[PDB]
Nucleic acid binder design. Structure first.
Ligand SMILES: [Mg+2]
Ligand SMILES: [Mg+2]
Ligand SMILES: [Mg+2]
Ligand SMILES: [Mg+2]
Ligand SMILES: [Mg+2]
Ligand SMILES: [Mg+2]
Ligand SMILES: [Mg+2]
Ligand SMILES: [Mg+2]
Ligand SMILES: [Mg+2]
Length: 207
RNA sequence: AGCUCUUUCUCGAUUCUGUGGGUGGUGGUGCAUGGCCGUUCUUAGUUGGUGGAGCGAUUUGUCUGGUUAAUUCCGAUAACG
Protein backbone atom coordinates (compact mmCIF):
# COMPACT_ATOMS: atom_id res chain seq x y z
CA UNK A 1 0.00 0.00 0.00
CA UNK A 2 0.70 3.72 -0.44
CA UNK A 3 0.30 4.27 3.33
CA UNK A 4 2.68 4.04 6.30
CA UNK A 5 0.95 1.30 8.40
CA UNK A 6 1.47 -1.10 5.49
CA UNK A 7 5.09 -0.05 4.71
CA UNK A 8 7.98 -2.46 5.21
CA UNK A 9 9.74 -2.18 8.58
CA UNK A 10 13.38 -2.76 9.41
CA UNK A 11 12.60 -5.96 11.31
CA UNK A 12 11.35 -7.68 8.14
CA UNK A 13 14.24 -6.76 5.84
CA UNK A 14 16.46 -8.66 8.30
CA UNK A 15 14.15 -11.70 8.08
CA UNK A 16 14.41 -11.43 4.26
CA UNK A 17 18.20 -11.17 4.09
CA UNK A 18 18.47 -13.94 6.71
CA UNK A 19 16.30 -16.40 4.73
CA UNK A 20 18.12 -15.32 1.50
CA UNK A 21 14.85 -14.43 -0.32
CA UNK A 22 16.51 -11.68 -2.41
CA UNK A 23 18.82 -14.19 -4.20
CA UNK A 24 17.44 -15.08 -7.65
CA UNK A 25 18.39 -17.70 -10.25
CA UNK A 26 20.92 -17.63 -13.12
CA UNK A 27 18.36 -17.24 -15.99
CA UNK A 28 15.86 -14.42 -16.42
CA UNK A 29 12.65 -14.46 -18.44
CA UNK A 30 11.23 -11.36 -20.10
CA UNK A 31 8.14 -11.25 -17.86
CA UNK A 32 10.03 -11.13 -14.51
CA UNK A 33 12.27 -8.31 -15.80
CA UNK A 34 10.51 -5.59 -13.76
CA UNK A 35 11.22 -7.35 -10.43
CA UNK A 36 15.04 -7.59 -10.82
CA UNK A 37 17.38 -4.96 -9.39
CA UNK A 38 20.65 -5.88 -11.15
CA UNK A 39 22.63 -9.03 -12.05
CA UNK A 40 25.48 -9.68 -9.61
CA UNK A 41 29.20 -9.84 -10.59
CA UNK A 42 28.81 -13.64 -10.83
CA UNK A 43 25.78 -14.71 -12.94
CA UNK A 44 22.89 -14.34 -10.45
CA UNK A 45 20.10 -11.78 -10.13
CA UNK A 46 19.03 -9.81 -7.06
CA UNK A 47 15.24 -9.58 -6.56
CA UNK A 48 13.94 -6.12 -5.56
CA UNK A 49 12.44 -6.38 -2.05
CA UNK A 50 10.13 -3.35 -2.16
CA UNK A 51 8.48 -5.00 -5.17
CA UNK A 52 8.23 -8.36 -3.33
CA UNK A 53 6.45 -6.53 -0.47
CA UNK A 54 3.95 -4.76 -2.73
CA UNK A 55 3.06 -7.98 -4.61
CA UNK A 56 2.71 -9.84 -1.26
CA UNK A 57 0.29 -7.20 0.08
CA UNK A 58 -1.65 -7.29 -3.21
CA UNK A 59 -1.99 -11.06 -2.76
CA UNK A 60 -3.16 -10.55 0.83
CA UNK A 61 -5.72 -7.96 -0.40
CA UNK A 62 -6.91 -10.52 -2.97
CA UNK A 63 -7.30 -13.25 -0.26
CA UNK A 64 -9.03 -11.09 2.39
CA UNK A 65 -11.79 -10.15 -0.06
CA UNK A 66 -13.00 -13.79 -0.22
CA UNK A 67 -15.76 -14.23 2.36
CA UNK A 68 -15.73 -18.03 3.00
CA UNK A 69 -12.12 -18.71 4.19
CA UNK A 70 -12.38 -22.38 3.08
CA UNK A 71 -12.43 -21.89 -0.74
CA UNK A 72 -8.93 -20.35 -0.93
CA UNK A 73 -7.37 -23.75 -1.69
CA UNK A 74 -3.57 -23.73 -1.36
CA UNK A 75 -1.36 -26.23 -3.16
CA UNK A 76 2.22 -27.46 -2.92
CA UNK A 77 3.78 -30.45 -4.67
CA UNK A 78 7.54 -30.19 -3.95
CA UNK A 79 8.82 -31.37 -0.57
CA UNK A 80 9.91 -27.88 0.59
CA UNK A 81 6.43 -26.31 0.55
CA UNK A 82 4.26 -29.01 2.12
CA UNK A 83 4.65 -28.04 5.79
CA UNK A 84 4.30 -24.39 4.84
CA UNK A 85 0.97 -24.85 3.07
CA UNK A 86 -0.33 -27.16 5.87
CA UNK A 87 0.52 -24.49 8.48
CA UNK A 88 -0.86 -21.67 6.28
CA UNK A 89 -4.16 -23.53 5.91
CA UNK A 90 -4.21 -24.12 9.66
CA UNK A 91 -3.49 -20.49 10.62
CA UNK A 92 -6.06 -19.08 8.16
CA UNK A 93 -8.74 -21.67 7.36
CA UNK A 94 -7.95 -22.60 3.70
CA UNK A 95 -7.92 -26.19 2.39
CA UNK A 96 -4.44 -27.52 1.58
CA UNK A 97 -3.19 -29.98 -1.02
CA UNK A 98 0.24 -31.50 -0.48
CA UNK A 99 1.69 -34.22 -2.68
CA UNK A 100 0.28 -35.49 -5.97
CA UNK A 101 -2.51 -33.51 -7.60
CA UNK A 102 -4.62 -36.24 -9.27
CA UNK A 103 -5.62 -34.34 -12.43
CA UNK A 104 -9.29 -33.57 -12.88
CA UNK A 105 -9.93 -32.44 -9.31
CA UNK A 106 -11.22 -29.11 -10.62
CA UNK A 107 -12.97 -30.43 -13.76
CA UNK A 108 -14.60 -33.77 -12.99
CA UNK A 109 -18.05 -34.06 -11.40
CA UNK A 110 -17.74 -37.66 -10.24
CA UNK A 111 -14.51 -37.78 -8.23
CA UNK A 112 -14.57 -37.53 -4.45
CA UNK A 113 -11.62 -35.12 -4.66
CA UNK A 114 -13.67 -32.68 -6.75
CA UNK A 115 -13.82 -29.18 -5.27
CA UNK A 116 -14.77 -25.74 -6.60
CA UNK A 117 -12.40 -23.15 -5.11
CA UNK A 118 -12.55 -19.37 -5.56
CA UNK A 119 -8.81 -18.63 -5.39
CA UNK A 120 -5.61 -20.60 -5.85
CA UNK A 121 -2.24 -20.01 -4.19
CA UNK A 122 0.74 -22.04 -5.34
CA UNK A 123 4.40 -22.32 -4.47
CA UNK A 124 6.03 -22.68 -7.87
CA UNK A 125 4.44 -22.14 -11.32
CA UNK A 126 6.91 -24.45 -13.04
CA UNK A 127 6.45 -27.42 -10.69
CA UNK A 128 2.68 -27.21 -10.05
CA UNK A 129 1.66 -26.60 -13.67
CA UNK A 130 -1.25 -29.06 -13.48
CA UNK A 131 -3.34 -26.91 -11.08
CA UNK A 132 -2.69 -23.91 -13.35
CA UNK A 133 -3.70 -25.76 -16.51
CA UNK A 134 -6.85 -26.96 -14.76
CA UNK A 135 -7.68 -23.54 -13.32
CA UNK A 136 -7.63 -22.40 -16.95
CA UNK A 137 -10.91 -24.32 -17.39
CA UNK A 138 -13.15 -23.12 -14.54
CA UNK A 139 -12.48 -19.36 -14.28
CA UNK A 140 -10.05 -19.65 -11.37
CA UNK A 141 -7.62 -16.83 -10.46
CA UNK A 142 -4.11 -17.67 -9.32
CA UNK A 143 -1.43 -16.36 -6.96
CA UNK A 144 2.08 -17.76 -7.26
CA UNK A 145 5.57 -17.38 -5.74
CA UNK A 146 7.96 -16.84 -8.71
CA UNK A 147 11.69 -17.39 -9.06
CA UNK A 148 13.53 -15.21 -11.64
CA UNK A 149 13.04 -18.04 -14.15
CA UNK A 150 9.30 -18.68 -13.59
CA UNK A 151 6.95 -18.68 -16.70
CA UNK A 152 4.07 -16.36 -15.85
CA UNK A 153 1.42 -18.23 -17.85
CA UNK A 154 -2.00 -18.45 -16.13
CA UNK A 155 -0.66 -16.73 -12.99
CA UNK A 156 -2.37 -13.48 -12.02
CA UNK A 157 -0.46 -12.15 -8.99
CA UNK A 158 3.18 -13.28 -9.10
CA UNK A 159 5.17 -12.68 -5.89
CA UNK A 160 8.93 -12.47 -6.68
CA UNK A 161 11.22 -14.43 -4.33
CA UNK A 162 13.94 -17.05 -4.12
CA UNK A 163 11.72 -20.11 -4.65
CA UNK A 164 14.39 -22.83 -4.29
CA UNK A 165 15.72 -22.83 -0.70
CA UNK A 166 13.57 -24.13 2.18
CA UNK A 167 14.04 -21.11 4.48
CA UNK A 168 12.88 -18.68 1.78
CA UNK A 169 9.71 -20.64 0.91
CA UNK A 170 8.63 -21.01 4.57
CA UNK A 171 9.29 -17.31 5.31
CA UNK A 172 7.09 -16.21 2.39
CA UNK A 173 4.17 -18.39 3.49
CA UNK A 174 4.61 -17.18 7.08
CA UNK A 175 4.50 -13.54 5.98
CA UNK A 176 1.46 -14.18 3.78
CA UNK A 177 -0.34 -15.64 6.86
CA UNK A 178 0.79 -12.69 9.01
CA UNK A 179 -0.61 -10.04 6.60
CA UNK A 180 -4.01 -11.73 5.88
CA UNK A 181 -4.58 -12.25 9.62
CA UNK A 182 -3.52 -8.61 10.30
CA UNK A 183 -5.88 -6.89 7.85
CA UNK A 184 -8.85 -9.24 8.47
CA UNK A 185 -8.89 -7.93 12.09
CA UNK A 186 -7.61 -10.68 14.41
CA UNK A 187 -3.83 -10.21 15.21
CA UNK A 188 -3.77 -6.37 15.22
CA UNK A 189 -0.57 -4.45 14.32
CA UNK A 190 1.91 -2.89 16.79
CA UNK A 191 2.64 -6.42 18.20
CA UNK A 192 5.11 -9.21 17.23
CA UNK A 193 3.44 -12.54 16.30
CA UNK A 194 3.32 -15.61 18.60
CA UNK A 195 4.33 -18.03 15.82
CA UNK A 196 7.98 -18.06 14.65
CA UNK A 197 8.73 -18.70 10.92
CA UNK A 198 10.55 -21.98 11.78
CA UNK A 199 7.20 -23.81 12.24
CA UNK A 200 6.76 -23.23 8.46
CA UNK A 201 10.26 -24.36 7.28
CA UNK A 202 11.08 -27.75 5.65
CA UNK A 203 12.14 -30.59 7.98
CA UNK A 204 15.15 -31.79 5.94
CA UNK A 205 15.33 -35.07 7.91
CA UNK A 206 16.96 -34.48 11.25
CA UNK A 207 19.70 -36.11 13.39
C1' A B 1 -50.70 -111.03 -50.03
C1' G B 2 -58.91 -112.41 -51.56
C1' C B 3 -52.77 -109.21 -55.10
C1' U B 4 -55.39 -110.56 -59.27
C1' C B 5 -58.85 -114.14 -61.92
C1' U B 6 -63.30 -118.17 -61.64
C1' U B 7 -67.40 -118.71 -57.84
C1' U B 8 -70.77 -116.11 -54.08
C1' C B 9 -71.18 -116.10 -49.02
C1' U B 10 -70.41 -112.68 -44.98
C1' C B 11 -70.25 -107.57 -42.60
C1' G B 12 -73.56 -103.12 -41.90
C1' A B 13 -73.31 -97.14 -42.40
C1' U B 14 -67.86 -97.19 -39.54
C1' U B 15 -67.07 -96.69 -45.86
C1' C B 16 -66.81 -95.59 -51.38
C1' U B 17 -66.64 -91.79 -55.82
C1' G B 18 -65.37 -86.51 -57.10
C1' U B 19 -63.89 -81.43 -55.87
C1' G B 20 -61.07 -78.44 -52.11
C1' G B 21 -57.90 -79.27 -48.11
C1' G B 22 -54.75 -81.77 -45.00
C1' U B 23 -50.79 -85.56 -43.73
C1' G B 24 -46.24 -87.93 -43.71
C1' G B 25 -41.12 -87.77 -45.47
C1' U B 26 -33.10 -90.56 -42.84
C1' G B 27 -36.68 -85.73 -49.56
C1' G B 28 -33.56 -80.51 -51.18
C1' U B 29 -31.17 -76.22 -49.22
C1' G B 30 -26.21 -75.94 -42.77
C1' C B 31 -24.95 -70.06 -48.25
C1' A B 32 -32.57 -68.95 -45.17
C1' U B 33 -32.33 -70.39 -39.39
C1' G B 34 -32.75 -71.89 -33.65
C1' G B 35 -29.93 -74.95 -30.39
C1' C B 36 -25.47 -77.56 -29.61
C1' C B 37 -20.42 -78.33 -30.74
C1' G B 38 -15.66 -77.33 -32.91
C1' U B 39 -12.05 -73.55 -33.99
C1' U B 40 -9.55 -68.77 -34.25
C1' C B 41 -6.75 -69.16 -28.99
C1' U B 42 -4.38 -71.95 -24.10
C1' U B 43 -2.70 -67.71 -24.72
C1' A B 44 -3.50 -62.86 -21.51
C1' G B 45 -6.78 -60.73 -23.64
C1' U B 46 -11.57 -57.23 -23.56
C1' U B 47 -15.05 -53.10 -22.39
C1' G B 48 -17.86 -48.88 -21.27
C1' G B 49 -19.12 -43.99 -17.48
C1' U B 50 -17.30 -38.84 -16.20
C1' G B 51 -12.58 -35.92 -17.31
C1' G B 52 -8.13 -34.59 -21.09
C1' A B 53 -6.22 -34.45 -26.88
C1' G B 54 -8.00 -34.17 -32.09
C1' C B 55 -12.52 -30.81 -37.29
C1' G B 56 -12.73 -36.45 -37.53
C1' A B 57 -12.07 -41.71 -38.02
C1' U B 58 -9.79 -42.25 -33.33
C1' U B 59 -6.84 -41.87 -28.74
C1' U B 60 -5.70 -41.74 -23.04
C1' G B 61 -7.17 -44.62 -18.97
C1' U B 62 -5.15 -50.24 -20.90
C1' C B 63 2.14 -47.33 -19.22
C1' U B 64 9.15 -45.77 -19.43
C1' G B 65 11.13 -49.68 -15.77
C1' G B 66 11.28 -54.08 -12.23
C1' U B 67 8.39 -58.56 -11.26
C1' U B 68 4.94 -62.74 -12.51
C1' A B 69 2.68 -68.87 -15.16
C1' A B 70 -0.80 -64.39 -15.95
C1' U B 71 -3.39 -56.60 -18.21
C1' U B 72 -0.08 -60.85 -11.56
C1' C B 73 1.69 -57.05 -8.74
C1' C B 74 5.12 -52.64 -7.33
C1' G B 75 5.24 -48.26 -9.04
C1' A B 76 4.91 -44.02 -12.77
C1' U B 77 0.98 -40.99 -13.94
C1' A B 78 -4.35 -36.43 -17.71
C1' A B 79 -6.67 -39.41 -15.48
C1' C B 80 -10.49 -41.00 -11.44
C1' G B 81 -13.51 -44.64 -10.04
MG1 LIG C 1 -44.43 -80.67 -43.87
MG1 LIG D 1 -37.67 -85.91 -39.84
MG1 LIG E 1 -22.56 -72.87 -40.49
MG1 LIG F 1 -24.65 -73.29 -37.12
MG1 LIG G 1 -14.67 -38.52 -24.28
MG1 LIG H 1 -13.41 -32.79 -28.16
MG1 LIG I 1 -6.39 -48.30 -26.17
MG1 LIG J 1 8.29 -64.25 -17.01
MG1 LIG K 1 -0.10 -49.04 -8.45
Amino acid sequence: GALDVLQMKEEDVLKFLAAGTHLGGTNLDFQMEQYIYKRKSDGIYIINLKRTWEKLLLAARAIVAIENPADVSVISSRNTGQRAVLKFAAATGATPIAGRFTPGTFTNQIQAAFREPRLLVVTDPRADHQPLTEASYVNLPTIALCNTDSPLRYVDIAIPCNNKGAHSVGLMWWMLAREVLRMRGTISREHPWEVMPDLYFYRDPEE
